[PDB]
Structures are given as structure tokens and as C-alpha cells.
């Protein structure tokens, strides 16, 4: 469980964030105890941030192995009073904690928090911070290193690591709130919907209150109960670019905590994707936390920038793209009512491109028991969302391979276990799957399929290409479910234009997305157009990467494609709800 | 005085950046009382960061007058034992803080600090934060509004405004470190130049020892008094490009704040511009705190990007060109060993381009009074900075004009008062001064031209050009003192090519350089060539700007043009000593 790090009347926070002492790893790092005395010969490095970007040379770009980060800490005595807590927010890929020379804490996965408390290493004066790093990709990681001394990403974008998100250091009393959950059971039935929100919440090391306000501060509610519930009528539900957050103040044992948390339901029936009780239809992108010189560092003036964009554009949606995005980035959705995807690290979980499969048990890959944590973990982190409306188990894995329904069920199962709204639960389908030979068919609520007809398929002929997507999709609806296109594209060089269109042309991508939309339309089971990508981002050099993945609506800049218009108008005349 | 506000044993320190509320002044805001209420129908804004950029539309870009920035904010009881204060380290033009709905400071000047205490007004539980910024530019402001309902900057950049540095809390015993002074004297006679340091330090609200350390940590030397002196024979003599920064442990009265501290002689001498008693030579730009979509928003990575790109092209020195820069950038330069000029707000100062003139007292510039704070606030910030070598009083004023010595002589006296290192003083001179109609000729150390011969003067006729800029700076060697040139370029879009140039092409603007960098070399007393600018950045709207100000050696996210190559290849064959 882990809250979000807030400044309460019970709790501070000081960020660690700035210029930190660095060194690449040569080895012998180890051997010698770095970690013990200060770093020696130091470059700076500003933290949060990728640091593969922020020097020059490929030598920081593709540096194999482990960094050493390291700054001198110090509180005062007179806070040794309450806990003392270290939260990582993200490390990606390995991250080993020493304080004064001692390991203190260790974690595996890039994209999700962790916290070790200080209470007893925290020494008196200044003390030695240091956060080791690895950036090593292979078959026990999420994402997935592949085989093809350098890390080979089986996932196209490049592989920034580093201390992506912040490090802060926040305290709390010693019996300290831990979790909070909170659901909600809507009776749309009145013409007045009214609601009922059930509380339940944890602490460890005593009386707990909770208390209950709306938008503007206004109290409107209050019980005691470590597990209680609570009544709204007249409530004012959360709604995709409407959003209402009400906000929650958790008094419990001279410790208080505050959550907001939006009213909604999010239900699938059918052919149709229901957000409180009403046919959505997702309009947005696939993202990736990507911009210069950050890397996948966090970045919240372009967290606000991409929103400001989205809404220009008249799009509801965007899916956390082959990880889980930062805290800070999905509560601003909950403010701005941005329906989101979450999706774990769980990317490049297919060696399909002796032969070994997939889900061979001593050759092929051994990412079940991470990605498991990964579910949990990330279920655990963003349960109390209103903006997640759906929960992405992996993008494109050899899912219509053999051991492919053995690896994934299991994870289906603790997913649809662990959400305390049980939210439906997918995963994104790689070209080439079919209903009959996707595991997804049946574990899956939503059919969400990545398929570029008009690219990799067909490209060129957009005629071929349209019967080709025409038959594949008419078949998917054999199912009865919702389907979404969670990806479509063209690789799009900004600037390039012709008046009979080439591929990479400004003029090509947007008759791909014509396209491409013009069949979409004809199938009412279709419920969402969400394309690849938003915007263009880094990722490894290869032939078929013209300085990076060129298939957004934006540049790396946030500057619009001429596809950014053309989605602009069509998504102006498309609602919400109700388009069918 | 203003420490840069750091974690120590005796002071805590929590970032108050994040996402905060957030409106746009109606007219109607101060008279109902939104510094009161929480505001109603809010937007969201990251903090630290200008908000001009990060909306849509010409509504936010180009605003009139007030917004209102609102967070809340909540300290444990805990804390009040010791001084609370809020340092907002920059909001761009005027600041007005409430708290719970009472005014607690105000503030004139957009890029320095400012502090209040909240000790007695810091209620109990949740606070109303409200930060009110104001974005208006008239002759009273530095920098200059112009008068041509609408702000008309009579500067080149644009008037990106808000909340544009962090916003922290940090505390202190109540009586407490207020301001370390260190100052050094050396001994370059011994073949292993020596070193005695100064110190002066003062409190507010007891015993005060002073501790030396070296690069790692070890201690050297100790003494007590708050005014007394320390000794280092065999002294690491901070260098530019060669950084050695020793630190310095203050502790008094249960108070301790730590230090870094580079030892060197700054001193003109003729034409030399001698740091540690060798003839120096400027080689680099003048730069702008200008990044999408931050606007003049502080940006940690690009920072080190930037200096990353400085090292990579051999470059030694920037200008804090139009304001003074962040703290963090400040020490980032000493770590990293970059020379800078610092140089205050005071652009605009100049209404040549029935007509007033400029220093008229009726009817022209209102500005001496602020001016004269903006000196004392930045050497009060500063003045403990190795990078810092010189002073910029006003970045091209009507320095030739009438009433223009008046003008600026009390404020270089009061700058050769306040240095505690008596460091040269000069400023920027606009294109149409001479050596004698130019009033920097007396007052300044440095005479620091703003040339434009092959651009603005003279262009595309590159020989007329050079004729003129031999004739010109030829006269300013009359002088017998040190002369650099702080801007000369030409508008690039990168991108454009040819082989036969033509204006705008990359291939004009090397030759432009070439040109100009050929004349340089005949004169001795040339101590300095700086490019403007070092990356493409954002102005007011005009025929004459495409997208913005392109004279960059980079575009604006810090891609090359071809000049930036024929930099690195001609500083890479000219050191930063004795190049004369
Ligand atoms: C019609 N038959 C084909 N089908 C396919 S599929 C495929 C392929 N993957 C697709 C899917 N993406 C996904 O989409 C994005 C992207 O690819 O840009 C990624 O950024 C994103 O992270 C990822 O989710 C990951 C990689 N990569 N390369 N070639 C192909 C290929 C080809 C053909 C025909 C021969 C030429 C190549
Ligand atoms: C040879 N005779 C001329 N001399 C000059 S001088 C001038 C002018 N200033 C120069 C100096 N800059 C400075 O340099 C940078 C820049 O200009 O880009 C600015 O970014 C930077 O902030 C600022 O410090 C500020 C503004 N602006 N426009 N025209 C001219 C002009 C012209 C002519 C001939 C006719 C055409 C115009
Ligand atoms: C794991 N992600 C991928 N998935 C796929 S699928 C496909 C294909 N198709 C699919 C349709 N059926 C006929 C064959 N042809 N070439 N490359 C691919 C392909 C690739 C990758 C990534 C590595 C590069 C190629
Ligand atoms: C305050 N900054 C300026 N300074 C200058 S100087 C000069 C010039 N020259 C100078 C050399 N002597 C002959 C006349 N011609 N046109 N514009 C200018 C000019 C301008 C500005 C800014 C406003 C736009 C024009």
C-alpha cells in the first residue's frame, strides 16, 4: 500500500529533489564501497530525471550496468519524535538504498514506488544518501530485455533509467494512517442519482474519524469507523471532461490524511463501455512519458501542456503506455476528468520477432511472479482513481501462443480480485492475433487491438488495407464484446508534404487515419479510436527508426502534425456519449 | 540577504511545488475577496513554472494583468517551536501573499527572492495559500514596458510571468544564520599559491564556531567569531572549466548552514581581463531561462543539458543575459566552472527606438529607485559566487544620451560598494554608441559591445560589414581597457541551406561568424567573444521575429545549427588562458 506523499496538520514532506552527486559505475564500483564514502571524481545530476540524455557522448547514453547517485541528507533531531520515511517514487529498473554505507532498502521495477523508514540509521549531523542503479534488461524484467555488452529493449522505445520520479521524506506519528479505500454504489434509478461511498480505512503501531467535504471545502458528512460507510444524495458524479472530486479528510490518532475521490461507474454490457451508466466512446492516444532532455524523468509543466493539448483537441482518453505513469500525472486526469488506462511494465512478454517460444519454462521467459507483483502493486497505487476506468495487464504479448493462457490467467484472476471496484481488466493485442487465437477473446472485457493497416500492413495501398482491417474487425465483433483500437499509425517526418502522397508525408498519415476511421465507423461494437502515438518519442537507433518513433500527431515538442487537425475536427463532432 | 535555503541539521526544508489552483484575474477579483475563499470554477497550474504557455489559446498567452495562484497548506504543530518562513525565490513582476485572507508580503521584481514569517499568522490546520501575480510593465518596472488593452515589452523576449522559480518553507532556530559573508585574499608569489579567507557571519534573534572542509569532506581548519579568519597554504584555486569548491560548516547557536566556497582573484589590468593572474579569454554566449512549455519556468535538466552542451563546444563563460538567473543555475556553474556574467533585470532603459528622451524626469524612465534595490538584492545573493566574474548593470540603455551618466553612476558606486570582492562593473552597449559618446567608457572596467555588423548593420553585404566593425572597434581600443563582445548573430532557421548564402540560411550565419571572428583576432584588448544566442527563444509577436528570436547556435530544445559546429572546432583551438 502507498499513499500519496501530501502535506497534512499530521504528516511533512521535503522533497530531495536537485543536483546530486554521480557516478557511472566502472566495475570495480562495488568492490570499492562507493556507497560508503563520498563519491570520488562526481559528475552532477539533476534529480528527478533520465540521466541517459542529460551529457554528451554515448557513453552516458549507452551506458551497460549500474550508476551511483549520492547526496548528504540531514533532519532535525526534533523530528526523531515521529516516523521518518524515505519514498522513492521510481528507480528505474534496480534501485539499492545505503545510508552512512549500509543498505537500508532495495526494489525491483521502474515505474512504481517504494519507501523504507530511517528511524534507526538516520545518524545525527549529515548523512551519506546513496541510490545505486541498474539498468539491465532481460527475461526476469519488466519490460522485457531481449537478446537482439548492451541492454537490447524487446519494446520500442529507449530505455532511460535513472531516479525517474522524485525522492522525498516525509514523517507520521507512530500509529500513522496506511491505506484508505473507498467504492461507491450509485442508484441512477431517482431522477436525482444519489450514492453511497464505503470507507475502510488502515493503520499500524486508538479512535479514526472520517470526515467528508465537496469541491470547495464545504463539510457535508461525518462517522467513526475503521470500516464504515457513508450517504450522498443529490451526488455530483465524476463524468469524462466534467470531472466533480469530492475530498476526504481522514482523522485517525493525531494523524490526518486527505483523498479526493470522484463519483462514477464504470460497468461493460455487451457491445458497450458504460461510464455511469451511458455508451462512452474513448477519442485519445496511446502516450509515453517521453520528452528532451528529461527522458522518462517527470515532467509536470508538459503533464499540464499535454492535457491543455488533449482538450484543444476534443479527446476524453489517453492509456498509461507500457507502464505505469506518475502519481502527479493521474490526479491531475481526476481533476481535469481524463479517462485513463492503466497499464503495467508488462511490454515485450513475446520473443515471437531451435526457435524458442514464448512461454517456454527454461528458455523463454520468467516474468510471472514481477508481473504479479506488478499488478498488485500498481492496483494497490491508483484503486481509488476515478480517471482509470479499465486496467491493461500487458501490451502485446505472443498472446494466441501455447503457455500463453496459463501465464496470463492467473494474472487476469488476481487483477479482477484486487480492485475494489472490479474494473474490467484486458489486455492490448498484437497484429496478427484473431478472435478464434487470442487468449484475449476469453479472459478479457474489452478486445483493445493494435493493428496498422495502412503501415505495416498494406503500406502504401490503403484500398488493400482497408479490406483487410474491414475482415479482420468484422470478425472481432463475433465475440459480443467491446472492441477499441488502442493503437493505430504512421511514422510521420513533421515537414514533409506532398500533393499525391509518399509514406512518412504529412498528407499520407492523415489519409491512414481517414482510412482506418471510415471503417471504424460502420461497426457499433467498436467503442474507441485511440491513436499511436501522441507524441514522437526516443527509442532505440535502428534502420526502421528515423531518429526515433516518428508516428505521432505531435513532434517531440508538442507541435502539432497536420493529423493534429484533422483529428481536432473529426473528434469536435463525436461525443462522449451516445455516438452509438 | 538571502542564503539559499538547503537542509541542514538545524533547518528543514519542504517544497510547496506541485499542481495549484489557479485563475485568471477577471477585474472583479480583488474587490470579492478571492484571496479569502477557496477560488471557485479553478484551472490547474503547476508551480514552479510561467503559465503563459501551458494553457490554450490567446487568452492565457497574452493576459492583462492579475492571476491567482491558491494551494493549501498545513504544518505540524510540531514545528512551531522553531521559525517558519516562506521563500519564494522568483514571481515574475509583483507578488502579493495571503494567508487564511490577509496580506502577509508583497514584492516588486520578478527574478530575485523574497521571504516572509509565519509563525503568527500560520493558523491551525488547513491554510488558504494565496500567491496573486501580476504581470503589468510600464517605465517603472525593470524590465521596461513599453508603450507600444495589452503589455509591449521595449525588450526582446517574451513576457512570460508567474510563479517562476519554487515556492518552499523551510525553518530556523529562533536565533539563527541570516548571512555568511567570504571573502579571500592569495599569495600567487609562492611557487604553491597560498590563501587567507575571511570570514563574516550574522545572526538574528550566543556562540558561533566556523568549520573548513575540503572536495570530500575531510576538515581542515577551525576558529571562532563571528568575524573572524582562516588559512589554506597549498589552496585548490577554483578555475574556469576546473572547478574546485571547498565548504564551510557554520554552526551557531544551535543553528549550523553549510557552504561551498571556490577560491580566485578576479582583477583587470590594461586590456587583460586576468582571473587568478592570467590574461582570460570569454568564450561562450548569452543565454535566456527560455524552455517549451515552461517559458522562463526553472528547469533542472535542461540546466545540465545546457552546460553538457557548453563542455561538449568548448565554450567557458555565459551571460545572465536580461535577469538574474536561478540559484540553482548559480551553483551549478560553480560546481561545473563556468565563468558568469550576472546581470540585473534593467533592460529597457532606453526609449530611442514630441519624442521624450529616455532619463527625462517628467515624462521618461521611473526606474533608478528599483534599480538600485535590484543591485543590493542581487549582490546580496551572489556575491559568494567563484563563477561570478563581473557585473552587468543594464543590458543596452540609452547610454550615450542625456541624463544617462547621471543615471548610472550611483548605481555603479553603490555596485563597486556592495561587491565584498570589488568585481569588475560594466554594462551592455547598444549598436550606435562610440568609445566617446558612451558613458560606459568611464564608469565600466570592461567596455561589452552588442554588435551587429552583418546582420542589422550592413547585411548581406559582409565586407561593408567587416569594414565597419574594423573602423568601430578599432576607436575602442583608445580606451586602453579590456573590450568583449557580450552579443553579435544573425536569425537562422535551422533548416534553411544553400550554397551560394542568403539571409536566414545556416550557411549565412557561419559566414556572418567568420566574418565577425576574423576582425576579432587583429585586437589584443578583445578579451571576449559571447554568440547571441546560445538557443532560439521566445518573443512578442512582429514582422521582424519568426516564431520567436532565432539567433540561436541551437534551436530552442537544444538541436545544433551547422554555426554550432563551426564554434565548437574554432574554441576547441583557443584556451581559456593566454590566448593573448
Ligand atoms: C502486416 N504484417 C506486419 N505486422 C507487423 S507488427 C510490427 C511491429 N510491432 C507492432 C506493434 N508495435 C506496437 O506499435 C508501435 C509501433 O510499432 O510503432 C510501438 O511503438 C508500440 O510500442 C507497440 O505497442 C510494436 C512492434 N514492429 N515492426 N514490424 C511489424 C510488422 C510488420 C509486418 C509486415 C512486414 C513489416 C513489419
Ligand atoms: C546598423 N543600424 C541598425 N542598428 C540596429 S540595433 C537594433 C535592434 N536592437 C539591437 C540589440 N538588441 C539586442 O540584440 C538582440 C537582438 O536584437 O536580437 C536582442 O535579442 C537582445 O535582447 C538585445 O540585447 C536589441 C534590439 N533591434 N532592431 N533593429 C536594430 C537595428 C537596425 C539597424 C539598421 C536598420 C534596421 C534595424
Ligand atoms: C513483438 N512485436 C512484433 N510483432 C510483430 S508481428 C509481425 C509480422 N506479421 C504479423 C502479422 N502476421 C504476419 C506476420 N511481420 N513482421 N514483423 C512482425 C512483428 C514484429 C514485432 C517486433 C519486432 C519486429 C517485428
Ligand atoms: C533599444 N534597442 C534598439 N536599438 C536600436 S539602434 C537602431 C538603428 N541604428 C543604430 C546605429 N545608428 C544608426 C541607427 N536603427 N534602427 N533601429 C535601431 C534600434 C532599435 C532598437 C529596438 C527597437 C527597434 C530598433
Same mark, same amino acid.
Given at each position: 500500500?502507498?499513499?500519496?506523499?501530501?502535506?497534512?496538520?499530521?504528516?511533512?514532506?521535503?522533497?530531495?529533489?536537485?543536483?546530486?552527486?554521480?557516478?557511472?559505475?566502472?566495475?570495480?564500483?562495488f568492490?570499492?564501497?562507493?556507497?560508503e564514502?563520498?563519491l570520488? =571524481?562526481?559528475?552532477?545530476?539533476?534529480?528527478?530525471?533520465? /540521466?541517459?540524455?542529460?551529457k554528451?557522448?554515448?557513453?552516458?547514453?549507452?551506458?551497460?550496468?549500474?550508476?551511483?547517485?549520492?547526496r548528504?541528507?540531514?533532519?532535525?533531531?526534533?523530528?526523531?519524535?515521529?516516523?521518518?520515511?524515505?519514498?522513492?517514487?521510481?528507480?528505474?529498473?534496480?534501485?539499492?538504498? /545505503?545510508?552512512?554505507?549500509? %543498505?537500508?532498502?532495495?526494489?525491483?521495477?521502474?515505474?512504481?514506488?517504494?519507501?523504507? $523508514?530511517?528511524?534507526?540509521?538516520?545518524?545525527?549531523? =549529515? &548523512?551519506?544518501?546513496?541510490?545505486?542503479?541498474?539498468?539491465?534488461?532481460?527475461?526476469?524484467?519488466?519490460?522485457?530485455?531481449?537478446?537482439?555488452?548492451?541492454?537490447?529493449?524487446?519494446?520500442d522505445?529507449?530505455?532511460?533509467?535513472?531516479?525517474?520520479?522524485?525522492?522525498?521524506?516525509?514523517?507520521?506519528?507512530?500509529?500513522?494512517?496506511?491505506?484508505?479505500?473507498?467504492?461507491?454504489?450509485?442508484?441512477?434509478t431517482?431522477?436525482?442519482?444519489?450514492?453511497?461511498? &464505503?470507507?475502510?480505512?488502515?493503520?499500524?503501531?486508538?479512535?479514526?474519524?472520517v470526515?467528508?467535504?465537496?469541491?470547495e471545502?464545504?463539510?457535508?458528512?461525518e462517522?467513526?469507523?475503521? $470500516?464504515?460507510?457513508?450517504?450522498?444524495?443529490?451526488?455530483?458524479?465524476?463524468?469524462? #471532461?466534467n470531472?466533480?472530486?469530492?475530498?476526504?479528510?481522514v482523522?485517525?490518532?493525531?494523524?490526518?490524511?486527505?483523498?479526493?475521490?470522484?463519483?462514477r461507474?464504470?460497468?461493460?454490457?455487451?457491445?458497450?463501455?458504460?461510464i455511469?451508466?451511458?455508451?462512452?466512446?474513448?477519442?485519445?492516444?496511446?502516450?509515453?512519458?517521453?520528452?528532451?532532455?528529461?527522458?522518462?524523468?517527470?515532467? %509536470?509543466?508538459?503533464?499540464?501542456?499535454?492535457?491543455?493539448?488533449?482538450?484543444?483537441?476534443?479527446? &476524453?482518453?489517453?492509456?498509461?503506455?507500457?507502464?505505469?505513469?506518475?502519481?502527479?500525472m493521474?490526479?491531475?486526469?481526476?481533476?481535469?476528468?481524463?479517462?485513463?488506462?492503466?497499464?503495467?511494465?508488462?511490454?515485450?512478454?513475446?520473443?515471437?520477432? $531451435?526457435?524458442?517460444?514464448?512461454?517456454?519454462?527454461?528458455?523463454?521467459?520468467?516474468t510471472?511472479?514481477?508481473?504479479?507483483?506488478?499488478?498488485?502493486?500498481?492496483i494497490?497505487?491508483?484503486?481509488?482513481?476515478?480517471?482509470?476506468?479499465?486496467?491493461?495487464?500487458?501490451?502485446?504479448?505472443?498472446?494466441?501462443?501455447?503457455?500463453?493462457?496459463?501465464?496470463?490467467?492467473?494474472?487476469?484472476?488476481?487483477?479482477?480480485?484486487?480492485?475494489?471496484?472490479?474494473?474490467?481488466?484486458?489486455?492490448?493485442?498484437?497484429?496478427?492475433?484473431?478472435?478464434?487465437?487470442?487468449c484475449?477473446?476469453? #479472459?478479457?472485457?474489452?478486445?483493445?487491438?493494435?493493428?496498422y493497416?495502412?503501415?505495416?500492413?498494406?503500406?502504401?495501398?490503403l484500398?488493400?488495407?482497408?479490406?483487410?482491417?474491414?475482415?479482420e #474487425?468484422?470478425?472481432?465483433?463475433?465475440?459480443?464484446?467491446?472492441?477499441?483500437?488502442?493503437e /493505430?499509425?504512421?511514422?510521420?517526418?513533421?515537414?514533409?508534404? =506532398?500533393?499525391?502522397?509518399?509514406?512518412?508525408?504529412?498528407?499520407?498519415?492523415?489519409?491512414?487515419?481517414?482510412?482506418?476511421?471510415?471503417?471504424?465507423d $460502420?461497426?457499433?461494437?467498436?467503442?474507441?479510436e485511440?491513436?499511436?502515438?501522441?507524441?514522437?518519442?526516443?527509442?532505440?537507433?535502428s534502420?526502421?527508426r528515423?531518429?526515433?518513433?516518428?508516428?505521432?500527431?505531435?513532434?517531440?515538442?508538442?507541435?502539432?502534425?497536420?493529423?493534429?487537425? /484533422?483529428?481536432?475536427?473529426?473528434?469536435?463532432?463525436?461525443?462522449?456519449?451516445?455516438?452509438?
Amino acid at each position: 500500500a502507498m499513499l500519496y506523499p501530501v502535506l497534512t496538520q499530521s504528516r511533512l514532506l521535503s522533497d530531495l529533489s536537485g543536483v546530486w552527486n554521480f557516478k557511472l559505475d566502472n566495475g570495480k564500483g562495488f568492490e570499492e564501497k562507493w556507497y560508503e564514502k563520498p563519491l570520488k =571524481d562526481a559528475d552532477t545530476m539533476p534529480v528527478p530525471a533520465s /540521466y541517459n540524455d542529460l551529457k554528451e557522448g554515448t557513453d552516458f547514453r549507452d551506458h551497460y550496468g549500474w550508476v551511483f547517485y549520492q547526496r548528504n541528507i540531514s533532519v532535525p533531531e526534533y523530528v526523531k519524535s515521529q516516523r521518518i520515511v524515505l519514498r522513492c517514487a521510481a528507480v528505474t529498473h534496480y534501485a539499492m538504498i /545505503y545510508l552512512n554505507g549500509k %543498505l537500508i532498502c532495495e526494489h525491483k521495477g521502474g515505474f512504481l514506488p517504494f519507501e523504507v $523508514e530511517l528511524n534507526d540509521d538516520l545518524q545525527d549531523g =549529515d &548523512n551519506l544518501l546513496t541510490i545505486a542503479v541498474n539498468n539491465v534488461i532481460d527475461y526476469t524484467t519488466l519490460p522485457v530485455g531481449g537478446k537482439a555488452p548492451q541492454n537490447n529493449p524487446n519494446f520500442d522505445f529507449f530505455n532511460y533509467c535513472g531516479i525517474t520520479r522524485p525522492v522525498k521524506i516525509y514523517t507520521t506519528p507512530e500509529t500513522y494512517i496506511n491505506d484508505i479505500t473507498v467504492t461507491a454504489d450509485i442508484d441512477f434509478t431517482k431522477e436525482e442519482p444519489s450514492a453511497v461511498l &464505503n470507507y475502510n480505512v488502515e493503520i499500524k503501531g486508538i479512535t479514526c474519524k472520517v470526515e467528508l467535504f465537496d469541491e470547495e471545502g464545504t463539510k457535508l458528512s461525518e462517522t467513526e469507523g475503521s $470500516e464504515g460507510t457513508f450517504e450522498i444524495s443529490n451526488v455530483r458524479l465524476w463524468q469524462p #471532461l466534467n470531472a466533480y472530486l469530492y475530498k476526504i479528510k481522514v482523522t485517525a490518532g493525531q494523524d490526518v490524511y486527505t483523498l479526493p475521490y470522484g463519483v462514477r461507474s464504470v460497468r461493460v454490457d455487451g457491445t458497450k463501455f458504460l461510464i455511469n451508466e451511458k455508451p462512452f466512446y474513448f477519442k485519445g492516444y496511446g502516450k509515453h512519458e517521453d520528452t528532451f532532455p528529461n527522458g522518462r524523468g517527470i515532467n %509536470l509543466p508538459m503533464n499540464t501542456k499535454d492535457i491543455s493539448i488533449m482538450k484543444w483537441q476534443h479527446a &476524453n482518453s489517453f492509456r498509461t503506455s507500457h507502464y505505469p505513469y506518475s502519481e502527479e500525472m493521474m490526479r491531475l486526469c481526476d481533476e481535469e476528468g481524463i479517462v485513463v488506462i492503466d497499464e503495467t511494465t508488462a511490454v515485450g512478454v513475446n520473443l515471437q520477432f $531451435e526457435r524458442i517460444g514464448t512461454f517456454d519454462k527454461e528458455h523463454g521467459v520468467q516474468t510471472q511472479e514481477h508481473h504479479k507483483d506488478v499488478i498488485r502493486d500498481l492496483i494497490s497505487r491508483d484503486k481509488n482513481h476515478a480517471c482509470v476506468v479499465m486496467w491493461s495487464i500487458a501490451n502485446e504479448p505472443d498472446s494466441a501462443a501455447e503457455g500463453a493462457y496459463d501465464y496470463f490467467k492467473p494474472l487476469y484472476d488476481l487483477a479482477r480480485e484486487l480492485d475494489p471496484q472490479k474494473r474490467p481488466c484486458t489486455l492490448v493485442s498484437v497484429q496478427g492475433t484473431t478472435a478464434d487465437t487470442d487468449c484475449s477473446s476469453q #479472459l478479457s472485457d474489452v478486445i483493445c487491438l493494435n493493428r496498422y493497416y495502412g503501415w505495416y500492413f498494406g503500406g502504401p495501398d490503403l484500398e488493400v488495407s482497408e479490406t483487410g482491417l474491414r475482415k479482420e #474487425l468484422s470478425d472481432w465483433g463475433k465475440l459480443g464484446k467491446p472492441v477499441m483500437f488502442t493503437e /493505430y499509425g504512421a511514422d510521420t517526418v513533421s515537414g514533409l508534404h =506532398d500533393t499525391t502522397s509518399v509514406m512518412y508525408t504529412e498528407e499520407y498519415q492523415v489519409e491512414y487515419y481517414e482510412m482506418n476511421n471510415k471503417v471504424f465507423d $460502420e461497426f457499433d461494437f467498436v467503442v474507441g479510436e485511440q491513436a499511436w502515438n501522441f507524441a514522437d518519442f526516443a527509442t532505440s537507433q535502428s534502420l526502421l527508426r528515423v531518429q526515433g518513433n516518428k508516428k505521432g500527431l505531435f513532434t517531440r515538442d508538442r507541435k502539432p502534425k497536420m493529423v493534429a487537425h /484533422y483529428f481536432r475536427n473529426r473528434w469536435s463532432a463525436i461525443p462522449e456519449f451516445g455516438y452509438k
